[PDB]
């Protein structure tokens, strides 16, 4: 029904190795050169990656900013309102980004803000100007 | 066993009538099932009786004596059965005590060419049937391809050596009739490379297993894939094995290729990530500067200036978030590359050291078939497999010749008589032979029928060594050329002291090249005396025949020194070297299914020749020329028991022909 | 034949 275990003999492969007088060593050479080709291509990309790893050395350690742990507040200070207007201008609808900029407002409070002051801070105009960029 | 076991021992299905039985008892086999089972019992029981005591003749009376009802009720059925079995050598064959002394006067004259086992077997049979029988042997001895060297206490078979299991072997019967000292062969065979170092059980078991797996593969190629014709020529076993090995080397490479190709996909995936990471560290570098600069603007500051600090703070931590999630990815891919590069697929399919030990396993096969594997028929080389005997193989410890010699007792054998021409006509035959010593001294033999047991190698000779008048028909001569007649040689080494492992029956030697894999590849320790026996097989066998004994004995000692110590191997007192292909009365060792032949050719060889009519318009003549011999028995070729049976077969056919089949009615 | 294999 099928070949023994660890023995590989497909109908196609038999025809290929018997196709002519030296189709045997021809096929075994193409793969021998294919192996050499792929093997040196490895070291080439191993060399390329080795250099890209040296540039990444140091990580981003001298660029990390300490954890700003602050408790969320309900009241919108005049300061915080203005920060918000600017955050809308720069981030559009990314409520998460805006929440991070202000620092003491939750993602939903930002969404609340969007509807409450919608009239007073012309948020319609502010948002359409964000898209223009 | 019992009644049923006797049928098995006689190579017959216990619960079914054979084609031969269908021929002789067409009334029974066409008839009701009840009759058939009675027939089968009578047959099986008679066989049992004969087998249980094979040293005395089993007569019809003795057979009827020991039967029950309703098996002894029909005496004509019992008589027909007994006579059938006796005629075809299933009972009362070989060497046995005769109850009713041989018939007063003979009927019919038969010349048998050659007193090999096949010849002798048939001779005894025909003489038992009361025919005038004279055998013509070119040699100064009986046995032919069964030859035994004897000098002092040294006994070694240059010809047949092994009894291939007793389970269904007619030689089992013969061994009870003749004083054969049958000793079993111990399976284990330690190998030794060219240097003289033993192959470790690690490699040993691996290579052997691979060998057996390569064979199964060729069988798969033949039957399942139907790879049997390549460029009009029939595919050999040799070709098939090369093809399989190549495909296995191709796979080893294919595995490596898609493994390294699996690396470059991961390696190149890492390349793209490292770029994204470097370009992000570049933006983080710049963004930190911007945030720094924004924070240097000391308070108090307006809201836009405050927003800048906050904005750049948000924008930085967000980009620092990304880089860490990318360092996450990098860590996983980095070890995934250590995963794949840790365990590579197979380096090679077989090393040079490996391929050499594999060549020994091929050489063993080249010995078994007595021929280079490039000549064996892929499809049929093993066709006689189903009929192989059960039980462990044995050796004749006192020399196989004991058997032909014992068969030759009480027979008219003309030794030193080389048959030159066989003449057969509607009215009879004349065989023209000469004396081998003075080849100008001529003999004429007249007979009703000629039984030809000439080896296939002889029948192959060109120009012919024996002439057939008229010439053998096209269908016969084609079968002769198609069939393979192989070669295998033995080197006898007689010492005064056992310097080898006495519990080891056989040990191998691995040759340097494929070219010389058969050259002295195996050694036998079997006999009482300190005798070692070296085999020359495959391609090597034919070439070693052109080399003198001294050189052959040289290479033998050289090898033996390498395994046991350069001093522990003394000079051989007596040495013998066979040359079977050179031997004019053999022209080789025994047959093999050559590429382009089949088992059917063996049947063709057995088919008898019937001459044309003397007077034109006269009736269709009797068959005159018959063929027995190792190369005529499809299911047991290239053996002793095969020959033995082929003899018995022809005897039965000839006796049916000239004495008449009294049992068919 | 096959049967002679060691
Ligand atoms: C090296 C070797 C090892 C073997 N080992 C085994 C084994 O282990 N087990 C096994 O079962 N079988 C073995 N065999 C095979 C076995 O020996 C033969 O198959 C068997 O003996 C052949 O019997 P035969 O009667 O058909 O042929 P032969 O024994 O050859 O008989 C034919 C006879 O005809 C004679 N003859 C030839 N030409 C002429 C002529 N012109 N005129 C008159 N006579 C002539 C020959 O001299 C010979 O005596 C081996 C064979 C060889 C060569």
mmCIF file of C-alpha atoms and ligand atoms in Angstrom, chain B residues 113-119 136-139 143-146 158-164 400 417-419 453-455 458 466 488 490 580 584-585 588-590 629-631 638-641 643, chain C residues 4, ligand 1:
data_model
loop_
_atom_site.group_PDB
_atom_site.id
_atom_site.type_symbol
_atom_site.label_atom_id
_atom_site.label_comp_id
_atom_site.label_asym_id
_atom_site.label_seq_id
_atom_site.Cartn_x
_atom_site.Cartn_y
_atom_site.Cartn_z
ATOM 1 C CA UNK B 113 22.373 -37.784 -18.853
ATOM 2 C CA UNK B 114 24.233 -36.827 -15.678
ATOM 3 C CA UNK B 115 24.307 -38.451 -12.239
ATOM 4 C CA UNK B 116 23.653 -35.281 -10.259
ATOM 5 C CA UNK B 117 21.020 -35.482 -7.523
ATOM 6 C CA UNK B 118 18.205 -34.901 -10.056
ATOM 7 C CA UNK B 119 19.591 -37.683 -12.275
ATOM 8 C CA UNK B 136 25.940 -41.281 -18.199
ATOM 9 C CA UNK B 137 28.312 -39.161 -16.130
ATOM 10 C CA UNK B 138 31.176 -37.107 -17.598
ATOM 11 C CA UNK B 139 32.861 -36.827 -14.188
ATOM 12 C CA UNK B 143 26.791 -35.882 -7.233
ATOM 13 C CA UNK B 144 27.796 -33.228 -9.753
ATOM 14 C CA UNK B 145 27.216 -29.852 -8.103
ATOM 15 C CA UNK B 146 27.209 -31.714 -4.789
ATOM 16 C CA UNK B 158 32.839 -27.293 -2.332
ATOM 17 C CA UNK B 159 29.305 -27.599 -3.702
ATOM 18 C CA UNK B 160 25.992 -27.786 -1.856
ATOM 19 C CA UNK B 161 26.340 -27.234 1.886
ATOM 20 C CA UNK B 162 23.122 -26.081 3.542
ATOM 21 C CA UNK B 163 19.836 -27.888 4.101
ATOM 22 C CA UNK B 164 17.444 -24.929 4.091
ATOM 23 C CA UNK B 400 26.967 -33.700 1.510
ATOM 24 C CA UNK B 417 31.351 -40.747 -20.236
ATOM 25 C CA UNK B 418 30.761 -37.333 -21.827
ATOM 26 C CA UNK B 419 27.553 -37.089 -23.873
ATOM 27 C CA UNK B 453 19.786 -33.382 -16.381
ATOM 28 C CA UNK B 454 22.571 -31.283 -17.931
ATOM 29 C CA UNK B 455 23.180 -28.049 -15.963
ATOM 30 C CA UNK B 458 26.064 -26.575 -20.111
ATOM 31 C CA UNK B 466 26.116 -31.222 -26.490
ATOM 32 C CA UNK B 488 29.645 -18.630 -6.569
ATOM 33 C CA UNK B 490 34.436 -21.493 -2.118
ATOM 34 C CA UNK B 580 32.513 -23.456 -11.039
ATOM 35 C CA UNK B 584 33.154 -27.706 -18.049
ATOM 36 C CA UNK B 585 30.473 -29.940 -16.454
ATOM 37 C CA UNK B 588 28.584 -21.890 -13.244
ATOM 38 C CA UNK B 589 27.004 -22.564 -9.854
ATOM 39 C CA UNK B 590 23.178 -22.510 -10.117
ATOM 40 C CA UNK B 629 17.449 -30.550 -12.952
ATOM 41 C CA UNK B 630 17.698 -27.626 -10.546
ATOM 42 C CA UNK B 631 16.694 -25.247 -13.391
ATOM 43 C CA UNK B 638 18.852 -23.560 -7.449
ATOM 44 C CA UNK B 639 18.815 -26.162 -4.636
ATOM 45 C CA UNK B 640 19.376 -29.847 -3.866
ATOM 46 C CA UNK B 641 15.794 -30.628 -2.828
ATOM 47 C CA UNK B 643 16.854 -31.140 -8.145
ATOM 48 C CA UNK C 4 20.562 -18.802 0.873
HETATM 49 C C1 LIG D 1 29.011 -23.502 -4.626
HETATM 50 C C2 LIG D 1 27.613 -24.070 -4.578
HETATM 51 C C3 LIG D 1 26.956 -24.155 -3.358
HETATM 52 C C4 LIG D 1 25.668 -24.674 -3.291
HETATM 53 N N1 LIG D 1 25.063 -24.748 -2.087
HETATM 54 C C5 LIG D 1 23.815 -25.244 -1.969
HETATM 55 C C6 LIG D 1 23.154 -25.332 -0.651
HETATM 56 O O1 LIG D 1 23.753 -24.939 0.368
HETATM 57 N N2 LIG D 1 21.913 -25.836 -0.588
HETATM 58 C C7 LIG D 1 21.255 -26.263 -1.685
HETATM 59 O O2 LIG D 1 20.100 -26.719 -1.543
HETATM 60 N N3 LIG D 1 21.800 -26.215 -2.933
HETATM 61 C C8 LIG D 1 23.049 -25.729 -3.143
HETATM 62 N N4 LIG D 1 23.653 -25.672 -4.422
HETATM 63 C C9 LIG D 1 22.925 -26.126 -5.611
HETATM 64 C C10 LIG D 1 22.882 -27.636 -5.770
HETATM 65 O O3 LIG D 1 24.188 -28.183 -5.569
HETATM 66 C C11 LIG D 1 22.430 -27.944 -7.188
HETATM 67 O O4 LIG D 1 21.256 -27.184 -7.491
HETATM 68 C C12 LIG D 1 22.116 -29.414 -7.426
HETATM 69 O O5 LIG D 1 23.135 -30.281 -6.907
HETATM 70 C C13 LIG D 1 22.020 -29.600 -8.931
HETATM 71 O O6 LIG D 1 21.658 -30.938 -9.244
HETATM 72 P P1 LIG D 1 21.401 -31.303 -10.780
HETATM 73 O O7 LIG D 1 21.352 -32.814 -10.827
HETATM 74 O O8 LIG D 1 20.239 -30.490 -11.300
HETATM 75 O O9 LIG D 1 22.719 -30.749 -11.544
HETATM 76 P P2 LIG D 1 24.202 -31.369 -11.362
HETATM 77 O O10 LIG D 1 24.407 -31.751 -9.908
HETATM 78 O O11 LIG D 1 25.177 -30.451 -12.067
HETATM 79 O O12 LIG D 1 24.119 -32.747 -12.199
HETATM 80 C C14 LIG D 1 24.324 -32.784 -13.613
HETATM 81 C C15 LIG D 1 25.399 -33.813 -13.934
HETATM 82 O O13 LIG D 1 25.613 -33.882 -15.345
HETATM 83 C C16 LIG D 1 27.016 -34.025 -15.585
HETATM 84 N N5 LIG D 1 27.345 -33.590 -16.962
HETATM 85 C C17 LIG D 1 27.548 -32.335 -17.411
HETATM 86 N N6 LIG D 1 27.817 -32.339 -18.742
HETATM 87 C C18 LIG D 1 27.782 -33.622 -19.163
HETATM 88 C C19 LIG D 1 27.966 -34.348 -20.450
HETATM 89 N N7 LIG D 1 28.262 -33.680 -21.590
HETATM 90 N N8 LIG D 1 27.837 -35.699 -20.445
HETATM 91 C C20 LIG D 1 27.548 -36.385 -19.317
HETATM 92 N N9 LIG D 1 27.366 -35.796 -18.118
HETATM 93 C C21 LIG D 1 27.467 -34.443 -17.981
HETATM 94 C C22 LIG D 1 27.677 -33.214 -14.487
HETATM 95 O O14 LIG D 1 29.025 -33.634 -14.253
HETATM 96 C C23 LIG D 1 26.748 -33.474 -13.309
HETATM 97 O O15 LIG D 1 27.171 -34.607 -12.543
HETATM 98 C C24 LIG D 1 24.967 -25.143 -4.527
HETATM 99 C C25 LIG D 1 25.628 -25.056 -5.752
HETATM 100 C C26 LIG D 1 26.921 -24.534 -5.815
HETATM 101 C C27 LIG D 1 27.623 -24.447 -7.141
#
